[PDB]
Ligand binder design. Structure first.
Ligand code: ATP
Ligand code: K
Ligand code: MG
Lengths: 96, 524, 96, 183
């Protein structure tokens, strides 16, 4: 187990959608990397200018639509690729 | 530019003079007692040859109308070489005889188009009679005899070609190339022996042989070229868990991937060797797929859809034994379903049937010989390069004749088959008297090969021709022994395809040539 | 359903205008992507330096003129394209 | 011997854009029965734009032939994969001809098969294309060298009207080459 610091989060990306809505198989660039991923670990919280750590709105086990970019990083925990990023990168959580 | 125009007898006489020049240069080579012709080459030493098509190709005359005749009759030898690969001299001799008799007839005032129609009818009937008279040539003894006769009575060439055909088989491909030694060598390789060597010298398992030897290896067939170890990493890990060696066929393995493969090769975790895929674009994929069917594997390509990260051991091919050297890669007893191999061979055969190019068809037949049957190389042994050229031409003639014999059968050699066919066509008649005369000139021309063979032996062509005609069946005159006998029994066999093609091409060209009344050419 | 975090908003873009004011059909570049869209979901609010979350002026169900750019992200909820962006990107709401 | 070879109906000299489209291996050709005929004037590289059309064709189940300038890259690869997977028997071929001619021939194929050509000039987009937009033919033989369409499902009167238009052009046409092409 790896837990993030400050406002960072450990998220495991979902497998790219092999098939489309109408059952058409997507390959190569068509099966683009998913922007949605499950949260494996949440940081303690962000540190404000005044010196208090504000908890993050993300919780462990909730699906999050992340924004791929320099902010997100690739790391391998137990031969499993996990992304590391700030809560800012997370756009919206997917509930239900 | 300004043109010289000639009409009637003058033009026909000049045409015949040119045809006679070319045919006299060519016919001195016909038969066992036939001599050699030296062809001056601008580059390299003069070529000495006993092949009608080469002499004919070199002929070109100063007189424009004679040169027209020479070129026209040269088409006969060229077409005979293109179709059968042998019989070019017999074809030139037949064309000269038809032209001479037909021009005589034209000088008698008969209609040349009717003469052409009679010649065409006689030749069609003659082709039918040749097919009827032909006998299959499937035994190796007859094949060796055919090769020996086509190699100017070189028993060694015939026996070597018979052995090569017996080994590689019907689907096997045989090629003739120069040899370093003085003796003819036969080299036969079975299964896949595509010409690609190890991408890294350190893959060599056996140093004293300078080659990689893999025992029961997996085969990975990737259509793409790779430079990173990440994508094959699952495949390498699966192989290491299995413990058997691995062979990589791909467009290119280089950089980090190749270096990692080499390091793992010494370290012993995986016995891995990588070579380049055979052929080039739009053909590399075909050879990869044939290897996959032979080894029971699947080709990893982006077009097919699969990725290398998802490749599994079942995806990998299987073979019993592998040899990698610097020049070629050999796979022995690939573990693949037989029915799939025959199905793939049938598809390649269908493309061959669809193919209309000599290069394309020979490449597909080479692929077939790689899948099933084998490939043979005949290294011609000669002391010098001029002897090498002459002997290679003779061996190529023998190979073409043997293939023709296997395809369509054999008939009596020594121009005996044409003599018998002409005898069987004595009752053939045309629509008018001019067509009958054309039939007769075709029949008389059918005696030209035997007469020229006898003439090249110094004997009397008419006496020998009369004696042969007085005989029946396969009875003929062996020019090598100057004796009479059964041409089949003494081993003087001519492929039916060669004789038929010579007759057909000579007839077409000569029949058109005798129809000429005007000749237009550049002024001198 | 997908709900945003912090000051982000989930907005569904309006279909491009097929016809002009005078009934002229616009095609290709003429029918440019609309900058106006309905709000499907609103984030809890923006977090200030002091650590309080200030609610967003935008509400659910109000038409908003949004500024297309890097700030907005394209995501598909139930096979329907929705834009995700900060309240800053929202220019003016279209009421009535 | 002199041989006579007579090809009836549409049979342009375009082959399959991908060898793996072959439904019948022993013949080395694709044989599509009652397939939709998609006619796109533009080239194709991404699968997104035809994706509604592919989903509709799948839902129906009939095969789909894509006559377009060029289908390659991601689009070609996904079409091939779906071809093996069996969801939709899809074959793609290059549009016959070149500049101006290609358009006209696409429109003649559309008239024969009762379809509509997808072009930017015409105005329609491929994302909005429907099954009714797609053409229809009784049979379609694809091989490596040529494409043959058998019994295109199109109104006869439209075919005669298009033929009459081409005849008028032939009459106006003066150049031998152009006239032979319209013929
Ligand atoms: N010992 C022999 N006795 C009689 N005829 C023979 C003998 N050996 C060969 N022949 C005949 O010689 C004829 C032609 O042989 P040759 O190689 O001289 O000419 P070709 O095959 O017509 O020409 P090319 O090699 O230029 O294509 C054949 O009809 C063959 O049967
Ligand atoms: K000869
Ligand atoms: Mg010969």
């Amino acid at each position: 187990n790896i837990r993030p610091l400050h406002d960072r989060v450990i998220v495991k990306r979902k497998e790219v959608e092999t098939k489309s809505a109408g059952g058409i198989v997507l390959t190569g660039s068509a099966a683009a990397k998913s922007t949605r991923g499950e949260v494996l670990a949440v940081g303690n919280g962000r540190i404000l200018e005044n010196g208090e750590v504000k908890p993050l709105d993300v919780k462990v086990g909730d699906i999050v639509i992340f924004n791929d970019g320099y902010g997100v990083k690739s790391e391998k925990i137990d031969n499993e690729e996990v992304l590391i990023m700030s809560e800012s990168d997370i756009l919206a959580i997917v509930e239900a | 530019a300004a043109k010289d125009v000639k009409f009637g007898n003058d033009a026909r006489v000049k045409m015949l003079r040119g045809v006679n020049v070319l045919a006299d240069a060519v016919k001195v080579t016909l038969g066992p007692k036939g001599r050699n012709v030296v062809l001056d080459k601008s580059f390299g030493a003069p070529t000495i040859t006993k092949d009608g098509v080469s002499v004919a190709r070199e002929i070109e005359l100063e007189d424009k109308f004679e040169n027209m005749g020479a070129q026209m009759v040269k088409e006969v030898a060229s077409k005979a070489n293109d179709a059968a690969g042998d019989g070019t001299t017999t074809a030139t001799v037949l064309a000269q005889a038809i032209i001479t008799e037909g021009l005589k007839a034209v000088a008698a005032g008969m209609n040349p188009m009717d003469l052409k129609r009679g010649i065409d009818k006689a030749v069609t009937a003659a082709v039918e009679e040749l097919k009827a008279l032909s006998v299959p040539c499937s035994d190796s003894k007859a094949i060796a005899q055919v090769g020996t006769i086509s190699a100017n009575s070189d028993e060694t060439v015939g026996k070597l070609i018979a052995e090569a055909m017996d080994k590689v088989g019907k689907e096997g491909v045989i090629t003739v190339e120069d040899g370093t030694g003085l003796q003819d060598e036969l080299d036969v390789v079975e299964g896949m022996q595509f010409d690609r060597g190890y991408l890294s010298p350190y893959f060599i398992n056996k140093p004293e042989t300078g080659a990689v030897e893999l025992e029961s290896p997996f085969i990975l067939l990737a259509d793409k070229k790779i430079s990173n170890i990440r994508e094959m990493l699952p495949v390498l890990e699966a192989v290491a868990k299995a413990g058997k060696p691995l062979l990589i066929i791909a467009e290119d393995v280089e950089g980090e991937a190749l270096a990692t493969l080499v390091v793992n090769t010494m370290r012993g975790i995986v016995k891995v060797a990588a070579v380049k895929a055979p052929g080039f674009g739009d053909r590399r994929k075909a050879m990869l797929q044939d290897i996959a069917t032979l080894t029971g594997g699947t080709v990893i390509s982006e077009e097919i859809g699969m990725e290398l990260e998802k490749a599994t051991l079942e995806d990998l091919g299987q073979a019993k034994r592998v040899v990698i050297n610097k020049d070629t890669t050999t796979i022995i007893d690939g573990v693949g379903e037989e029915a799939a191999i025959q199905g793939r061979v049938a598809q390649i055969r269908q493309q061959i049937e669809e193919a209309t190019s000599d290069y394309d068809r020979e490449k597909l037949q080479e692929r077939v010989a790689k899948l099933a049957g084998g490939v043979a190389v005949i290294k011609v042994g000669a002391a010098t390069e001029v002897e090498m050229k002459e002997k290679k031409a003779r061996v190529e003639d023998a190979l073409h004749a043997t293939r023709a014999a296997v395809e369509e059968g054999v008939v009596a050699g020594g121009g005996v088959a044409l003599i018998r066919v002409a005898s069987k066509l004595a009752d053939l008649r045309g629509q008018n008297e001019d067509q009958n005369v054309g039939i007769k000139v075709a029949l008389r021309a059918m005696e030209a090969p035997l007469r020229q063979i006898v003439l090249n032996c110094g004997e009397e062509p008419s006496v020998v021709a009369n004696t042969v005609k007085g005989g029946d069946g396969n009875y003929g005159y062996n020019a090598a022994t100057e004796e009479y006998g059964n041409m089949i029994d003494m081993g003087i066999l001519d492929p039916t395809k060669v004789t038929r093609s010579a007759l057909q091409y000579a007839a077409s060209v000569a029949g058109l040539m005798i129809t000429t009344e005007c000749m237009v050419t550049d002024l001198p």
